[PDB]
Amino acid sequence: QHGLHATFMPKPIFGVNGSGMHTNTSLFKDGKNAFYDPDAPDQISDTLRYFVGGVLKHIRAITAITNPLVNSYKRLVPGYEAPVYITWSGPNRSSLIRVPAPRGNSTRIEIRSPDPSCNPYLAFAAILAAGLDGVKNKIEPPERVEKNIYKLTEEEREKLGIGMLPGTLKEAIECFKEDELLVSALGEHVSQSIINVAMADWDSYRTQVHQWELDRYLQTY
Amino acid sequence: GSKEDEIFRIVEEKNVRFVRLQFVDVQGIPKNVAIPVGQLEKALGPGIHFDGSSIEGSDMVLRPDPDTFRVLPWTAEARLICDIELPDGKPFMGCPRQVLKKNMEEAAKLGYVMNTGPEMEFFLFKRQDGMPTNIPQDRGGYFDLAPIDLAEEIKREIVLVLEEMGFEVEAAHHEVAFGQHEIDFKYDNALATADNVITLKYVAKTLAL
Ligand SMILES: [Mg+2]
């Protein structure tokens, strides 16, 4: 109407910040906040750590749903607001999952990896299925990384067992293919449709000759 | 003198009609007085008078150095690097060439002689509407070869013109930045090298135009 164009693309411009969809998530069991425990340290319930543990276990596979475009992986690069390393921590340090200060009925986690181009119906279903699995199977999450990861060295990150999110759409789709929990939660029909559309885009994108290649090689070679 | 007789031989042989009495201001910018060949005897003898306010950035004499007589390879024209003296005959201590000569003479008293071999870097830019720009003529890199280095003919002409003026170059090559080049000079005394540096800048800018 105003002669403009609004876009929810993850990374429309190179060199600037990309658009993200940070999902503030809270689980309620029996009307009360299941993420709250007044007797536990910091006032965080066991259900919160098992939910976080479950999401982090399948986060590589969830990335195919929450970051579904080829362009989504141009947003998952260091130097910007977007998380790239698979860590969870407190509010002071921005990581993939961040547990803010508010307590009581406002106890929550914030999953920062998704982008606004994802299907919200499928993104929340994938987070619910992975989070509930960790609670059911009582999956303990890794240690909280309060130090910045960007300043840490590559060899140091390898010693701490810190992982990385998928670098390409094909890489996330390969991880999603093997995740039996998410394929069953989303159904064989939706899971196959996601794979088919993503690989059709990936096979078209990989064969293309982009302008960067002409700028880098045409004059010299 | 005989050096003077040598000059007049080259004048008749190459048909020199104009001579440039070159000199340099405190900032290193080349300045000159163009005189017809008829006044060359007057220049090599009592000298040509001019205004010394230009050297700063009001009356002095141009004293040509006979060893610096060179025919410009582009009727023919010739050049002569000049030292500045005051009307009475004393050397003008504001002349940069006379300053280097003094410092070299002091070093010579202690038996010391300094040899310099500079590595001259420069850029070759395009021209837009008769005015110079900072747009590289070529998109070349470090030690690149043609057609990546487009300025190979101009550099070839620069070194050829220098050799035709009693000047020997060690090597020339394309530098790191786009349109940047370097000409490495051979070793020589501080005075000859400084004369050579001024000549290179003049030749490179003339052939670029
Ligand atoms: Mg946020």
GROMACS .gro file of C-alpha atoms and ligand atoms in nm:
model
  431
    1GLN     CA    1   0.000   0.000   0.000
    2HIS     CA    2   0.292   0.240   0.076
    3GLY     CA    3   0.494   0.135  -0.235
    4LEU     CA    4   0.731  -0.076  -0.019
    5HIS     CA    5   0.805  -0.450   0.024
    6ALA     CA    6   0.813  -0.625   0.363
    7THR     CA    7   1.015  -0.946   0.371
    8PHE     CA    8   1.070  -1.216   0.633
    9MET     CA    9   1.373  -1.357   0.439
   10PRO     CA   10   1.653  -1.471   0.682
   11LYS     CA   11   1.943  -1.290   0.508
   12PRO     CA   12   1.833  -1.047   0.233
   13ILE     CA   13   2.154  -0.838   0.246
   14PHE     CA   14   2.512  -0.961   0.288
   15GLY     CA   15   2.724  -0.782   0.551
   16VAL     CA   16   2.431  -0.666   0.769
   17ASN     CA   17   2.224  -0.839   1.044
   18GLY     CA   18   1.975  -1.106   0.934
   19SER     CA   19   1.611  -1.149   1.041
   20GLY     CA   20   1.554  -1.404   1.319
   21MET     CA   21   1.249  -1.543   1.504
   22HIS     CA   22   1.349  -1.584   1.870
   23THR     CA   23   1.081  -1.811   2.019
   24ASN     CA   24   1.017  -1.745   2.390
   25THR     CA   25   0.894  -2.086   2.511
   26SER     CA   26   0.732  -2.188   2.841
   27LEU     CA   27   0.580  -2.525   2.940
   28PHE     CA   28   0.280  -2.545   3.174
   29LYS     CA   29   0.183  -2.870   3.347
   30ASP     CA   30  -0.148  -2.854   3.533
   31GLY     CA   31  -0.199  -2.474   3.500
   32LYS     CA   32   0.128  -2.399   3.685
   33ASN     CA   33   0.459  -2.319   3.517
   34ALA     CA   34   0.643  -2.657   3.479
   35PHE     CA   35   0.976  -2.469   3.430
   36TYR     CA   36   0.965  -2.327   3.784
   37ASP     CA   37   1.088  -2.486   4.111
   38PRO     CA   38   1.118  -2.247   4.413
   39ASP     CA   39   1.341  -2.489   4.611
   40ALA     CA   40   1.591  -2.560   4.327
   41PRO     CA   41   1.904  -2.341   4.266
   42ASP     CA   42   1.836  -2.029   4.054
   43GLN     CA   43   1.465  -2.149   4.078
   44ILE     CA   44   1.483  -2.364   3.759
   45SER     CA   45   1.294  -2.697   3.760
   46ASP     CA   46   1.432  -3.032   3.633
   47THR     CA   47   1.161  -3.017   3.357
   48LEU     CA   48   1.337  -2.704   3.215
   49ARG     CA   49   1.677  -2.878   3.185
   50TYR     CA   50   1.524  -3.194   3.036
   51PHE     CA   51   1.325  -2.981   2.786
   52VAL     CA   52   1.645  -2.789   2.691
   53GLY     CA   53   1.839  -3.118   2.666
   54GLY     CA   54   1.581  -3.263   2.429
   55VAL     CA   55   1.573  -2.955   2.203
   56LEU     CA   56   1.957  -2.943   2.188
   57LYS     CA   57   1.975  -3.318   2.109
   58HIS     CA   58   1.761  -3.275   1.793
   59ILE     CA   59   1.857  -2.910   1.715
   60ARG     CA   60   2.057  -3.012   1.405
   61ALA     CA   61   1.740  -3.178   1.267
   62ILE     CA   62   1.504  -2.897   1.391
   63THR     CA   63   1.720  -2.653   1.184
   64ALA     CA   64   1.574  -2.802   0.860
   65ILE     CA   65   1.223  -2.695   0.982
   66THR     CA   66   1.308  -2.364   1.162
   67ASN     CA   67   1.569  -2.250   0.901
   68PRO     CA   68   1.417  -2.407   0.583
   69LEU     CA   69   1.552  -2.193   0.296
   70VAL     CA   70   1.896  -2.209   0.130
   71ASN     CA   71   1.931  -1.840   0.238
   72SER     CA   72   1.870  -1.933   0.607
   73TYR     CA   73   2.229  -2.065   0.629
   74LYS     CA   74   2.370  -1.729   0.509
   75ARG     CA   75   2.212  -1.591   0.838
   76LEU     CA   76   2.374  -1.871   1.051
   77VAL     CA   77   2.723  -1.712   1.017
   78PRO     CA   78   2.944  -1.557   1.296
   79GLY     CA   79   2.966  -1.181   1.364
   80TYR     CA   80   2.587  -1.120   1.384
   81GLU     CA   81   2.301  -1.156   1.641
   82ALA     CA   82   2.221  -1.514   1.517
   83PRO     CA   83   2.346  -1.821   1.711
   84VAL     CA   84   2.580  -2.061   1.527
   85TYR     CA   85   2.719  -2.280   1.812
   86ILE     CA   86   2.502  -2.533   2.000
   87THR     CA   87   2.512  -2.401   2.361
   88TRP     CA   88   2.266  -2.293   2.633
   89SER     CA   89   2.336  -2.030   2.901
   90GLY     CA   90   2.199  -1.748   3.123
   91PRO     CA   91   2.081  -1.403   3.015
   92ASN     CA   92   2.419  -1.221   3.020
   93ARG     CA   93   2.554  -1.429   2.726
   94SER     CA   94   2.359  -1.474   2.398
   95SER     CA   95   2.362  -1.841   2.289
   96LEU     CA   96   2.123  -2.083   2.100
   97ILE     CA   97   1.898  -2.130   2.410
   98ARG     CA   98   1.900  -1.854   2.672
   99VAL     CA   99   1.722  -1.872   3.011
  100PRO     CA  100   1.608  -1.515   3.105
  101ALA     CA  101   1.597  -1.373   3.464
  102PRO     CA  102   1.211  -1.355   3.516
  103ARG     CA  103   1.077  -1.632   3.747
  104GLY     CA  104   0.739  -1.763   3.873
  105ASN     CA  105   0.474  -1.770   3.600
  106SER     CA  106   0.720  -1.586   3.363
  107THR     CA  107   0.986  -1.866   3.380
  108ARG     CA  108   1.083  -1.937   3.019
  109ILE     CA  109   1.359  -2.028   2.769
  110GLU     CA  110   1.435  -1.843   2.443
  111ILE     CA  111   1.527  -2.050   2.137
  112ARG     CA  112   1.717  -1.801   1.911
  113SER     CA  113   1.806  -2.026   1.613
  114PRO     CA  114   1.481  -2.005   1.403
  115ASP     CA  115   1.420  -1.746   1.132
  116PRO     CA  116   1.087  -1.581   1.034
  117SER     CA  117   1.071  -1.770   0.699
  118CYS     CA  118   0.987  -2.102   0.876
  119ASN     CA  119   0.642  -2.262   0.886
  120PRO     CA  120   0.533  -2.171   1.244
  121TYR     CA  121   0.297  -2.472   1.267
  122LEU     CA  122   0.586  -2.711   1.198
  123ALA     CA  123   0.850  -2.516   1.395
  124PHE     CA  124   0.645  -2.529   1.720
  125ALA     CA  125   0.549  -2.896   1.661
  126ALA     CA  126   0.920  -2.988   1.620
  127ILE     CA  127   1.022  -2.793   1.934
  128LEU     CA  128   0.735  -2.953   2.135
  129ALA     CA  129   0.821  -3.309   2.023
  130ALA     CA  130   1.197  -3.270   2.089
  131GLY     CA  131   1.142  -3.089   2.422
  132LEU     CA  132   0.886  -3.345   2.547
  133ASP     CA  133   1.117  -3.634   2.449
  134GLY     CA  134   1.397  -3.493   2.668
  135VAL     CA  135   1.152  -3.458   2.961
  136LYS     CA  136   1.016  -3.811   2.908
  137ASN     CA  137   1.361  -3.976   2.864
  138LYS     CA  138   1.517  -3.738   3.126
  139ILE     CA  139   1.794  -3.617   2.891
  140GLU     CA  140   2.044  -3.399   3.082
  141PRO     CA  141   2.165  -3.094   2.883
  142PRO     CA  142   2.537  -3.005   2.848
  143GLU     CA  143   2.710  -2.758   3.084
  144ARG     CA  144   2.606  -2.389   3.054
  145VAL     CA  145   2.865  -2.196   2.845
  146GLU     CA  146   2.868  -1.853   3.017
  147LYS     CA  147   3.190  -1.744   2.835
  148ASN     CA  148   3.157  -1.600   2.481
  149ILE     CA  149   3.213  -1.866   2.216
  150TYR     CA  150   3.318  -1.620   1.939
  151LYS     CA  151   3.636  -1.517   2.133
  152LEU     CA  152   3.722  -1.882   2.222
  153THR     CA  153   3.967  -2.069   1.993
  154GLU     CA  154   3.868  -2.357   1.756
  155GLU     CA  155   4.075  -2.614   1.950
  156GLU     CA  156   3.919  -2.493   2.280
  157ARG     CA  157   3.562  -2.534   2.140
  158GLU     CA  158   3.657  -2.892   2.031
  159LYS     CA  159   3.776  -2.976   2.387
  160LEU     CA  160   3.447  -2.854   2.544
  161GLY     CA  161   3.244  -3.069   2.298
  162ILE     CA  162   3.065  -2.761   2.154
  163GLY     CA  163   2.890  -2.841   1.827
  164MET     CA  164   2.782  -2.625   1.534
  165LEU     CA  165   2.450  -2.584   1.358
  166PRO     CA  166   2.428  -2.721   0.998
  167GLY     CA  167   2.623  -2.504   0.751
  168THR     CA  168   2.403  -2.576   0.445
  169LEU     CA  169   2.036  -2.671   0.379
  170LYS     CA  170   2.146  -3.014   0.249
  171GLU     CA  171   2.344  -3.069   0.573
  172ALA     CA  172   2.032  -2.996   0.788
  173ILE     CA  173   1.806  -3.209   0.564
  174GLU     CA  174   2.049  -3.504   0.598
  175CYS     CA  175   2.029  -3.468   0.981
  176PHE     CA  176   1.646  -3.432   0.969
  177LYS     CA  177   1.623  -3.747   0.748
  178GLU     CA  178   1.786  -3.957   1.024
  179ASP     CA  179   1.588  -3.805   1.316
  180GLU     CA  180   1.317  -4.073   1.364
  181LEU     CA  181   1.145  -3.870   1.640
  182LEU     CA  182   1.079  -3.557   1.427
  183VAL     CA  183   0.985  -3.758   1.115
  184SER     CA  184   0.720  -3.945   1.323
  185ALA     CA  185   0.605  -3.624   1.503
  186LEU     CA  186   0.556  -3.432   1.174
  187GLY     CA  187   0.433  -3.743   0.986
  188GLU     CA  188   0.579  -3.923   0.683
  189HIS     CA  189   0.376  -3.697   0.449
  190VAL     CA  190   0.510  -3.360   0.578
  191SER     CA  191   0.863  -3.487   0.637
  192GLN     CA  192   0.887  -3.618   0.277
  193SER     CA  193   0.739  -3.292   0.136
  194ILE     CA  194   1.001  -3.087   0.330
  195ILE     CA  195   1.281  -3.308   0.192
  196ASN     CA  196   1.150  -3.294  -0.164
  197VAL     CA  197   1.110  -2.910  -0.173
  198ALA     CA  198   1.444  -2.846   0.005
  199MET     CA  199   1.642  -3.081  -0.223
  200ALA     CA  200   1.474  -2.939  -0.536
  201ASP     CA  201   1.594  -2.590  -0.424
  202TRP     CA  202   1.940  -2.721  -0.323
  203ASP     CA  203   1.997  -2.909  -0.652
  204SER     CA  204   1.898  -2.591  -0.846
  205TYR     CA  205   2.113  -2.360  -0.624
  206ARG     CA  206   2.431  -2.576  -0.628
  207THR     CA  207   2.445  -2.597  -1.012
  208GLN     CA  208   2.403  -2.217  -1.056
  209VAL     CA  209   2.699  -1.994  -1.148
  210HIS     CA  210   2.673  -1.697  -0.912
  211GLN     CA  211   2.810  -1.346  -0.979
  212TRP     CA  212   3.073  -1.392  -0.700
  213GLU     CA  213   3.246  -1.653  -0.919
  214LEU     CA  214   3.256  -1.422  -1.224
  215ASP     CA  215   3.389  -1.137  -1.004
  216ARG     CA  216   3.655  -1.366  -0.847
  217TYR     CA  217   3.771  -1.570  -1.153
  218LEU     CA  218   3.665  -1.422  -1.494
  219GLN     CA  219   3.940  -1.156  -1.530
  220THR     CA  220   4.231  -1.361  -1.389
  221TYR     CA  221   4.158  -1.712  -1.529
  222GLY     CA  222   8.533   2.427  -2.225
  223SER     CA  223   8.517   2.084  -2.395
  224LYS     CA  224   8.190   1.968  -2.226
  225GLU     CA  225   8.036   2.280  -2.376
  226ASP     CA  226   8.186   2.193  -2.720
  227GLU     CA  227   8.028   1.844  -2.679
  228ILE     CA  228   7.686   2.005  -2.611
  229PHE     CA  229   7.698   2.225  -2.926
  230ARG     CA  230   7.798   1.914  -3.135
  231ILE     CA  231   7.488   1.725  -3.012
  232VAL     CA  232   7.278   2.042  -3.081
  233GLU     CA  233   7.372   2.054  -3.452
  234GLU     CA  234   7.362   1.674  -3.487
  235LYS     CA  235   7.007   1.620  -3.341
  236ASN     CA  236   6.879   1.967  -3.451
  237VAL     CA  237   6.799   2.095  -3.099
  238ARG     CA  238   6.602   2.422  -3.119
  239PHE     CA  239   6.491   2.474  -2.754
  240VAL     CA  240   6.660   2.399  -2.419
  241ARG     CA  241   6.488   2.360  -2.078
  242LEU     CA  242   6.680   2.502  -1.783
  243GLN     CA  243   6.543   2.257  -1.525
  244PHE     CA  244   6.553   2.311  -1.150
  245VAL     CA  245   6.344   2.206  -0.845
  246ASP     CA  246   6.159   2.396  -0.568
  247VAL     CA  247   6.176   2.310  -0.196
  248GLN     CA  248   5.878   2.070  -0.250
  249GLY     CA  249   6.053   1.862  -0.522
  250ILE     CA  250   5.831   1.994  -0.805
  251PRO     CA  251   6.026   2.043  -1.131
  252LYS     CA  252   6.043   2.401  -1.260
  253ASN     CA  253   6.210   2.527  -1.580
  254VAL     CA  254   6.286   2.822  -1.810
  255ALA     CA  255   6.254   2.740  -2.182
  256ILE     CA  256   6.514   2.926  -2.391
  257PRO     CA  257   6.574   2.906  -2.769
  258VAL     CA  258   6.900   2.741  -2.880
  259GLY     CA  259   7.044   3.086  -2.967
  260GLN     CA  260   7.060   3.167  -2.592
  261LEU     CA  261   7.240   2.835  -2.502
  262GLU     CA  262   7.583   3.004  -2.523
  263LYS     CA  263   7.459   3.276  -2.283
  264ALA     CA  264   7.323   3.009  -2.043
  265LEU     CA  265   7.649   2.807  -2.032
  266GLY     CA  266   7.852   3.133  -1.992
  267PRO     CA  267   7.718   3.419  -1.772
  268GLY     CA  268   7.387   3.234  -1.705
  269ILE     CA  269   7.017   3.320  -1.749
  270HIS     CA  270   6.846   3.550  -1.496
  271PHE     CA  271   6.503   3.475  -1.343
  272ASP     CA  272   6.281   3.532  -1.027
  273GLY     CA  273   6.366   3.309  -0.726
  274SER     CA  274   6.028   3.360  -0.551
  275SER     CA  275   5.911   3.029  -0.719
  276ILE     CA  276   6.179   2.824  -0.530
  277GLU     CA  277   6.007   2.922  -0.198
  278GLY     CA  278   5.660   2.806  -0.313
  279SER     CA  279   6.346   3.801  -0.644
  280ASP     CA  280   6.650   3.785  -0.884
  281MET     CA  281   6.884   3.486  -0.932
  282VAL     CA  282   7.094   3.315  -1.206
  283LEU     CA  283   7.049   2.966  -1.352
  284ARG     CA  284   7.382   2.775  -1.371
  285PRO     CA  285   7.349   2.474  -1.599
  286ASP     CA  286   7.541   2.154  -1.508
  287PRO     CA  287   7.707   2.049  -1.843
  288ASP     CA  288   7.712   1.679  -1.735
  289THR     CA  289   7.325   1.688  -1.726
  290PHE     CA  290   7.271   1.787  -2.096
  291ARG     CA  291   7.023   1.535  -2.245
  292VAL     CA  292   6.810   1.546  -2.562
  293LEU     CA  293   6.443   1.468  -2.482
  294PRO     CA  294   6.367   1.150  -2.694
  295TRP     CA  295   6.018   1.280  -2.789
  296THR     CA  296   6.305   1.985  -3.438
  297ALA     CA  297   6.435   1.851  -3.106
  298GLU     CA  298   6.438   1.972  -2.744
  299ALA     CA  299   6.708   1.938  -2.476
  300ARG     CA  300   6.730   1.976  -2.094
  301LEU     CA  301   6.990   2.099  -1.843
  302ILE     CA  302   6.966   2.057  -1.465
  303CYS     CA  303   7.067   2.391  -1.310
  304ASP     CA  304   7.209   2.503  -0.976
  305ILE     CA  305   7.099   2.839  -0.837
  306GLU     CA  306   7.336   3.119  -0.743
  307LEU     CA  307   7.275   3.475  -0.631
  308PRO     CA  308   7.351   3.762  -0.881
  309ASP     CA  309   7.695   3.815  -0.717
  310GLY     CA  310   7.803   3.451  -0.777
  311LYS     CA  311   7.761   3.290  -0.432
  312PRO     CA  312   7.547   2.967  -0.424
  313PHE     CA  313   7.188   3.011  -0.304
  314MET     CA  314   7.151   2.790   0.007
  315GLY     CA  315   6.773   2.769  -0.054
  316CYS     CA  316   6.833   2.548  -0.364
  317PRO     CA  317   6.766   2.179  -0.277
  318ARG     CA  318   7.031   2.057  -0.523
  319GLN     CA  319   7.295   2.287  -0.363
  320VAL     CA  320   7.194   2.157  -0.014
  321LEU     CA  321   7.259   1.791  -0.113
  322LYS     CA  322   7.589   1.900  -0.280
  323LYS     CA  323   7.699   2.069   0.047
  324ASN     CA  324   7.612   1.769   0.266
  325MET     CA  325   7.794   1.536   0.020
  326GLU     CA  326   8.104   1.763   0.029
  327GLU     CA  327   8.106   1.752   0.412
  328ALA     CA  328   8.085   1.370   0.398
  329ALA     CA  329   8.368   1.371   0.135
  330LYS     CA  330   8.591   1.560   0.386
  331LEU     CA  331   8.558   1.254   0.619
  332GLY     CA  332   8.620   1.014   0.321
  333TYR     CA  333   8.252   0.905   0.315
  334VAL     CA  334   8.039   0.863  -0.003
  335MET     CA  335   7.672   0.751   0.015
  336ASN     CA  336   7.520   0.543  -0.269
  337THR     CA  337   7.140   0.528  -0.309
  338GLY     CA  338   6.924   0.288  -0.515
  339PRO     CA  339   6.555   0.377  -0.468
  340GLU     CA  340   6.251   0.159  -0.540
  341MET     CA  341   6.007   0.402  -0.707
  342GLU     CA  342   5.638   0.308  -0.669
  343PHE     CA  343   5.366   0.492  -0.862
  344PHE     CA  344   5.009   0.463  -0.994
  345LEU     CA  345   4.875   0.489  -1.348
  346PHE     CA  346   4.519   0.626  -1.346
  347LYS     CA  347   4.258   0.697  -1.613
  348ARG     CA  348   4.165   1.049  -1.728
  349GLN     CA  349   3.805   1.177  -1.745
  350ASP     CA  350   3.731   1.482  -1.965
  351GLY     CA  351   4.096   1.588  -1.982
  352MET     CA  352   4.132   1.584  -1.599
  353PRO     CA  353   4.314   1.321  -1.388
  354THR     CA  354   4.127   1.067  -1.169
  355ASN     CA  355   4.222   0.802  -0.903
  356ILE     CA  356   4.063   0.514  -1.110
  357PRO     CA  357   4.325   0.241  -1.183
  358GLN     CA  358   4.392   0.183  -1.554
  359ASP     CA  359   4.446  -0.191  -1.482
  360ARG     CA  360   4.302  -0.445  -1.238
  361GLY     CA  361   4.638  -0.615  -1.170
  362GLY     CA  362   4.814  -0.745  -0.862
  363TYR     CA  363   5.163  -0.825  -0.734
  364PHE     CA  364   5.415  -0.908  -1.016
  365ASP     CA  365   5.124  -0.969  -1.261
  366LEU     CA  366   5.180  -1.020  -1.637
  367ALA     CA  367   4.973  -0.885  -1.934
  368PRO     CA  368   4.683  -0.876  -2.017
  369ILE     CA  369   4.631  -0.846  -1.637
  370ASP     CA  370   4.899  -0.566  -1.637
  371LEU     CA  371   4.769  -0.324  -1.910
  372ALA     CA  372   5.050  -0.070  -1.850
  373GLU     CA  373   5.331  -0.290  -1.991
  374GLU     CA  374   5.380  -0.075  -2.306
  375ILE     CA  375   5.392   0.252  -2.105
  376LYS     CA  376   5.646   0.104  -1.857
  377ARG     CA  377   5.850  -0.034  -2.152
  378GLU     CA  378   5.851   0.320  -2.304
  379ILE     CA  379   5.948   0.478  -1.966
  380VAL     CA  380   6.255   0.253  -1.921
  381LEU     CA  381   6.347   0.295  -2.292
  382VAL     CA  382   6.329   0.679  -2.264
  383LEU     CA  383   6.538   0.666  -1.943
  384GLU     CA  384   6.807   0.446  -2.106
  385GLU     CA  385   6.824   0.704  -2.391
  386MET     CA  386   6.925   0.967  -2.122
  387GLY     CA  387   7.225   0.789  -1.958
  388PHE     CA  388   7.001   0.609  -1.708
  389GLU     CA  389   7.015   0.238  -1.616
  390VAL     CA  390   6.719   0.061  -1.443
  391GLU     CA  391   6.759  -0.262  -1.244
  392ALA     CA  392   6.401  -0.401  -1.289
  393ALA     CA  393   6.031  -0.299  -1.321
  394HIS     CA  394   5.714  -0.484  -1.213
  395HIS     CA  395   5.344  -0.450  -1.126
  396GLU     CA  396   5.280  -0.382  -0.753
  397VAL     CA  397   5.013  -0.506  -0.501
  398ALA     CA  398   4.740  -0.244  -0.566
  399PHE     CA  399   4.538  -0.209  -0.892
  400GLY     CA  400   4.722   0.009  -1.145
  401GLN     CA  401   5.028   0.033  -0.917
  402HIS     CA  402   5.380  -0.020  -1.052
  403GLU     CA  403   5.746  -0.004  -0.937
  404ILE     CA  404   6.073   0.080  -1.112
  405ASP     CA  405   6.384  -0.024  -0.916
  406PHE     CA  406   6.683   0.203  -0.975
  407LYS     CA  407   7.049   0.105  -0.995
  408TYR     CA  408   7.302   0.226  -0.738
  409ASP     CA  409   7.457   0.568  -0.783
  410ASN     CA  410   7.583   0.875  -0.586
  411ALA     CA  411   7.318   1.079  -0.400
  412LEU     CA  412   7.330   1.372  -0.652
  413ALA     CA  413   7.300   1.157  -0.969
  414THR     CA  414   7.027   0.946  -0.805
  415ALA     CA  415   6.826   1.257  -0.702
  416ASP     CA  416   6.863   1.401  -1.057
  417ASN     CA  417   6.743   1.061  -1.187
  418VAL     CA  418   6.440   1.052  -0.951
  419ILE     CA  419   6.322   1.396  -1.079
  420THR     CA  420   6.375   1.282  -1.441
  421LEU     CA  421   6.171   0.961  -1.385
  422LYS     CA  422   5.873   1.155  -1.244
  423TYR     CA  423   5.884   1.397  -1.540
  424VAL     CA  424   5.915   1.116  -1.801
  425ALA     CA  425   5.646   0.894  -1.640
  426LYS     CA  426   5.393   1.181  -1.619
  427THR     CA  427   5.473   1.297  -1.977
  428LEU     CA  428   5.441   0.949  -2.133
  429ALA     CA  429   5.124   0.878  -1.931
  430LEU     CA  430   4.960   1.191  -2.078
  431MG      MG  431   1.592  -1.196   2.197
   0.00000   0.00000   0.00000
